[PDB]
């Protein structure tokens, strides 16, 4: 009957996510909190060669008009499918060990992750779609593959003024991509709130024409991720979405509605972000585990991952 | 709550999968090959792109790396219809009903593993896909729900070539190396299911690849003894080992049935009907599941079937 607390630190790159997470883990006991870091052994070496270098190289190539849109999409799609592998396998092996939600006693174990599978199967692809290097059909294929959302999926997204964000990144510095990813994560927070407030994309689809994930009123559908799928490519001759793409939005709705999103303000010092994140964890949802030996089992899985793909 | 019978007709293309199932009232709906998605909706002529790319690679016109990117991206397009269908159907599937009639019989032209495992693996064997990409697709195979009955085919290679030759799809190229690779993959798949069902532990038998069930060397696990996935000391990276654990878990609970395709279309259809007696039926979760599932199947057919 021990409980588990899973916290996914996600959102745009360059906000201070990794540092904040490491500082939070550093305050805890080595046996009650484990960090599942960015899979760097996997991405620069194991899954393929330099996968980050290839992505930014292709977007610059495409932006300068050196390659076609089709050429970039093939590269982006394959890179994304590769890049998300570690998150997906981690989720798949952890899944059998997760029971139902308990409540917001201290968990026997706290697993903090550097990103959730939706970063690679939804957010980055969506941003690449906005940058013209991924088709909307491909984005929806990734959405259709997002794994079922485990109970107690606490996701922490970041808030940070664009100017301070840009400043932080200034040491290929793609400002268009930075804007696209910030917009996508902004849409993501609004989408969760929309769904949790009873929003039905099919009911509101007609309102399309032209963030706070756990607070505030119901957002307009135009301020959610649904708005991105109005593309001409996805529309049939009658004007509505083909059913295939509609079903993928149904999956998007299902996967995001049960998530627990929190917003962390990164516009402060590293210790400030840490203590703020520590405050946020108090209101997060824990889950029971399915077996007695799941704590130790999950714990070593996390350590192993940590040891191999990031350290 | 009413009962459901899901039957996925799969295995290599060109055996008569499609001909056979078409031949086989309102209590039986067919989810056909999403050809319109592949040719127009998801992208332009995906099969042509796949076969042209392999051809370019074979002729030395493009590198292995160039072909793999093209190939991996195209596989995403090919599998989307199956993956979205599985995801929307999942919540309606209840537990097993066990050993009378199914209220609804859902026959599908292929299961998600065709696109997330078998084709990618065959392309790996053809040198146009990296093993890391294959395991990336494997990691996304949806959880195996109860009542996952998959029909695989039996057919001598010579007859298969003949049948393949007179049922080429738009943009397809008659490739005997690909036929061999896909036949190999599906044979390994059947063996892998039996290996797992009889208690085989890939981790326990892994050492046998470098020396009452099939040898691990005759299963899909042998394909993953690929140098790209191993560390300098020969150990499989844990990331990849985890993907193999997922593979074992997904495949072990499937119910595989073999259909002899070395007979007339009418014969193939009759044999298929006889195989349903041993298939596993499940209950649905809601009272409106049948009709909803029905709508889904009819809608898919109308929109994506050729």
Swiss-Prot record, chain A:
Enzymatic reactions: thymidine + ATP = dTMP + ADP + H(+)
Binding sites annotated in the UniProt record for ATP: 11-18, 168
Enzyme Commission number(s) from the entry: 2.7.1.21
Keyword tags: ATP-binding, DNA synthesis, Early protein, Kinase, Nucleotide-binding, Transferase
Active-site residues, as the UniProt record annotates them: 38
InterPro entries from the UniProt entry: Herpes_TK (IPR001889), P-loop_NTPase (IPR027417)
One GO biological process term: DNA biosynthetic process
Practical applications according to UniProt: Used in molecular biology as a selectable marker to identify transfected eukaryotic cells. Used in cancer suicide gene therapy to selectively kill transformed cells.
UniProt xrefs under Gene3D superfamilies: P-loop containing nucleotide triphosphate hydrolases (3.40.50.300)
Pfam families (UniProt xref): Herpes_TK
Molecular-function annotations in GO: ATP binding; thymidine kinase activity
Domain of life: Viruses
Residues engaged in binding substrate: 56, 80
Subunit structure: Homodimer.
Role played: Catalyzes the transfer of the gamma-phospho group of ATP to thymidine to generate dTMP in the salvage pathway of pyrimidine synthesis. The dTMP serves as a substrate for DNA polymerase during viral DNA replication. Allows the virus to be reactivated and to grow in non-proliferative cells lacking a high concentration of phosphorylated nucleic acid precursors.
Remarks, miscellaneous: Phosphorylates and thereby activates certain drugs like acyclovir (ACV), valacyclovir, and famciclovir to a toxic form, that leads to successful suppression of the infection, while the uninfected cell does not have this ability because it lacks TK. Mutations in thymidine kinase may induce HSV resistance to antiviral therapies in immunocompromised patients. The most frequently observed resistant strains are unable to express TK and are avirulent in animal models of disease.
UniProt similarity note: Belongs to the herpesviridae thymidine kinase family.
Protein known as: Thymidine kinase
Name of the gene: TK
From Swiss-Prot, chain B:
Annotated organism of origin: Human herpesvirus 1 (strain 17) (HHV-1)
Pfam families, alphabetized: Herpes_TK (PF00693)
Assembly and oligomerization: Homodimer.
Catalytic reaction equation(s): thymidine + ATP = dTMP + ADP + H(+)
Gene behind the chain: TK
Top EC class, one word: transferase
Protein family membership: Belongs to the herpesviridae thymidine kinase family.
Biotechnology remark: Used in molecular biology as a selectable marker to identify transfected eukaryotic cells. Used in cancer suicide gene therapy to selectively kill transformed cells.
Keywords carried by this UniProt record: ATP-binding, DNA synthesis, Early protein, Kinase, Nucleotide-binding, Transferase
A GO term for molecular function: ATP binding
Function: Catalyzes the transfer of the gamma-phospho group of ATP to thymidine to generate dTMP in the salvage pathway of pyrimidine synthesis. The dTMP serves as a substrate for DNA polymerase during viral DNA replication. Allows the virus to be reactivated and to grow in non-proliferative cells lacking a high concentration of phosphorylated nucleic acid precursors.
Enzyme Commission code(s) on record: 2.7.1.21
Superkingdom in the source lineage: Viruses
Name of the protein described by the UniProt record: Thymidine kinase
Residues given in the record as substrate binding sites: 51, 75, 169
Binding-site list for ATP: 11-18, 163
Other comment: Phosphorylates and thereby activates certain drugs like acyclovir (ACV), valacyclovir, and famciclovir to a toxic form, that leads to successful suppression of the infection, while the uninfected cell does not have this ability because it lacks TK. Mutations in thymidine kinase may induce HSV resistance to antiviral therapies in immunocompromised patients. The most frequently observed resistant strains are unable to express TK and are avirulent in animal models of disease.
């Amino acid at each position: 009957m021990p409980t588990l607390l899973r916290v996914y630190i996600d959102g745009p790159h360059g906000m201070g996510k990794t540092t904040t997470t490491q500082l939070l883990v550093a305050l805890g006991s080595r046996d009650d909190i484990v960090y599942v870091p960015e899979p760097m052994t996997y991405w620069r070496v194991l899954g393929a060669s330099e996968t980050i270098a290839n992505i930014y190289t292709t977007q610059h190539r495409l932006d300068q008009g050196e390659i076609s849109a089709g050429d970039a999409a093939v590269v982006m799609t394959s890179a994304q499918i590769t890049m998300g592998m570690p998150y997906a396998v981690t989720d798949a092996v952890l899944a059998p060990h997760i029971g139902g939600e308990a409540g917001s006693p201290p968990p026997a174990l706290t697993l903090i992750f550097d990103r959730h599978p939706i970063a690679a199967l939804l957010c980055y692809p969506a941003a690449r779609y906005l940058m013209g290097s991924m088709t909307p059909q491909a984005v929806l294929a990734f959405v259709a593959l997002i794994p079922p959302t485990l109970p107690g999926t606490n996701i922490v997204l970041g808030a940070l003024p664009e100017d301070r964000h840009i400043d932080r990144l200034a040491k290929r510095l793609d400002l268009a991509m930075l804007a696209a990813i910030r917009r996508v994560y902004g849409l993501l927070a609004n989408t969760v709130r929309y769904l949790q407030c009873g929003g039905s994309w099919r009911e509101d689809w007609g309102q399309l024409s032209g963030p706070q994930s756990n607070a505030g009123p119901r957002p307009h559908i135009g301020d959610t991720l649904f708005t991105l799928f109005r593309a001409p490519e996805l529309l049939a001759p009658n004007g509505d979405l083909y059913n295939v793409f509609a079903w993928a939005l149904d999956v998007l709705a299902k996967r995001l509605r049960s998530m627990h999103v929190f917003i962390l303000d990164y516009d402060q010092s590293p210790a400030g972000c840490r203590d703020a994140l520590l405050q946020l964890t108090s209101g997060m949802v824990q889950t029971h585990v399915t077996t007695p030996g799941s704590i130790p089992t999950i714990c070593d899985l996390a350590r192993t991952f940590a040891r191999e793909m990031g350290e």
